[PDB]
Amino acid sequence: DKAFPGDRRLSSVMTIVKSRPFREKQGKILLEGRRLIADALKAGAVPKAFFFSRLEYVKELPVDKLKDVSLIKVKFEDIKDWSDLVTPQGIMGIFAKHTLPLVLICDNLRDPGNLGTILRSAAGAGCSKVLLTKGCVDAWEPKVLRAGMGAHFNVEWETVPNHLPPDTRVYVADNCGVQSYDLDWTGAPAAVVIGGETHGVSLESLQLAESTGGKRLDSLNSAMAASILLFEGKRQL
Amino acid sequence: DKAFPGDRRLSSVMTIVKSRPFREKQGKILLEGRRLIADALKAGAVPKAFFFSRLEYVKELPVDKLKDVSLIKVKFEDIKDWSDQGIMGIFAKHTLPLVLICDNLRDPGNLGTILRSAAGAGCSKVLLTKGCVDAWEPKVLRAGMGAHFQVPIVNNVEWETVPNHLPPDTRVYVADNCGVQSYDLDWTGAPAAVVIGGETHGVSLESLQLAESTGGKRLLIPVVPGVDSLNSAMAASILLFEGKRQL
Amino acid sequence: KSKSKTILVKLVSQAGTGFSFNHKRSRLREKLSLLHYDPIVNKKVLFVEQKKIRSL
RNA sequence: AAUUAUAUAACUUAUCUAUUUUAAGUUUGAAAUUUCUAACCUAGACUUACAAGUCAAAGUAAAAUUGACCCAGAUAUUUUGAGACCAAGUUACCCUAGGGAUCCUAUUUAAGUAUCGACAAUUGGAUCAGGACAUCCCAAUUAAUGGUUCGUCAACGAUUAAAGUCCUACGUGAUCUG
């Protein structure tokens, strides 16, 4: 294992992964987890550095978590710099930081955690339409990567406004919250607008989604409710 | 810190609030986070005590967003135990009614949130993982943002309430990925009684046989991708609400 | 508590006298057939395992 | 509180009444309870509420991750079982026992022992940081050397060589009173 994190290159990598602004400046972020790293490789994400433990590297399981990065034995200090979190994972990868439609649009910068959770639900839901703001916010951070958990693995303002012009209604959802399959989120056009993780979604968020022309499906757990909706969304299709 | 130094029950409430095991022992389900506290709060729970940092509980800033949860001092170590988020609002742990059941152990948030999902839809009684499984525990309920006993969604069900959930004449369906169609089931068409088995435990054969008494058909959600199955508890939540609407 | 290696079983006389005694055997081995003293017949006779009592 | 509360009282069912086709439940509470195959035998010993179970000279006899008893089982008398029960307040209605009043400081050391005296050993801020090593940054298996920003039990944004994990009555500036 490589335990030397004091190198200038290691310090730059540590700064980018540890700090989101450094990640945006350096364009590099870290994904923690062998499953998450493997999903990144399938998605085509190009990893810059692969963090493998002294035992994980020998087992080659961390090597499979390269996510297109070069896999080399790494100790805690080296792994910590590669990983965006303080605690480095055994397998981690340092990578870059209509009619009856299912569309979710988020303008401006979005919380990296929210993006990962939303993307993970989207993979289960299988929505054919996705909307987002520019790439300013980095969703490759270890916290964001943890939110995706491999399930997650640039629409900008102009295209994002196009989704808003479309006549779609965002199905409401709440911890307490009509039925999930009784809402035409997939059966009818949907423009998912709810309180993001960066701002927080209260019971008003469910009402706000209802105000978008949708009905109820009180803050619901982002992972649990989104996963439940994704299963209902698949049934809707 | 204990809610009241002399009052042992106050200390237990505070400890149970910020403690997955202690909450299960004390039958308390905490909703970590002020917004999640409101989640359990708006789901029909009036948390007697809320796990929050001693100084934070005194300030009661998350209590403002608890919207029912009663801010209570919580030890830092206890807060970590209940971590799934600081404002853990500890709370006590029909025909065509929404019915979710996260049978067996599963993701703490999935079980709690899935059970609560039925409550808002009009669930007469929503269910979660059994008392043995950690679903109503402070940390377990914390991720779900729901209370077991107080909210219709129950996790510290115990033996008595456990038959109660099944005992209703609502056709039941186990929903993971391919348990007819999630919303087009006999159970979904009839009163909702969805009971998804644990993700790592599955559905018991006896439970499948018991489904005959209910008359429901296990939930099968078509999946375009090759994923083996979706969140079991999450599937139950969708089936839970879906059944009520169809019924 | 979680660990479990041996088990306790009833060894019953094959002479029909009804005399039985308990012995410990590994869970992963075959049923025991042992020659043991039976007081009723006052001589050693064959004993065959019938039922498992508990996990040791 | 914890557990209840066939004192009574009610309702329900009986009961008992009309027609005609008190008891048992439950609830109030008079209250109550508790707390805050791997032997047998036999000196001398172990373990143990009791009991059983152990070690062991001699003797005799076969051979060469629980642990007993009680207590319940099974069957026909043979076998099989793993000294505040649990449990909050309040008392100036009380009782008894008493205790009061009626950056220093104390040692040790002594760089600079008349008089002194470092280093040591025994609400937010501003200013300045000290310390732990389980090493983030800086540095050569070794090392705590100095540092580790500003904001919005988790998380995010922007910088920084880095924003380790933390401790030091907001770490640390000299209201006023009880």
Numbering used by the authors:
A (entry chain x): 95 to 191, 206 to 261, 268 to 291, 337 to 376, 385 to 404
B (entry chain y): 95 to 178, 183 to 191, 206 to 291, 337 to 404
C (entry chain 1): 10 to 65
Give the text the authors published on this PDB structure.
Structural analysis by cryo-electron microscopy demonstrated that SAM-dependent methylation is required for peptidyl transferase centre formation during mitoribosome assembly. Our cryo-EM analysis of the mtLSU from SAM-depleted mitochondria reveals ten distinct assembly intermediates demonstrating how methylation can orchestrate mitoribosome maturation. During translation, peptide bond formation occurs in the PTC, predominantly formed by 16S rRNA during the late stages of mtLSU assembly and involves the folding and methylation of the A and P loops.
States A1-A4 are the earliest mtLSU assembly states identified here, characterised by an immature central protuberance (CP) and an A-loop of H92 held by an MRM3 dimer, which would typically methylate G2482. In states A3/A4, DDX28 dissociated, allowing the recruitment of bL33m and the adoption of a more mature and structured CP. Early states (A1–A4) exhibit an immature CP with MRM3 dimers bound to H92, poised to methylate G2482.
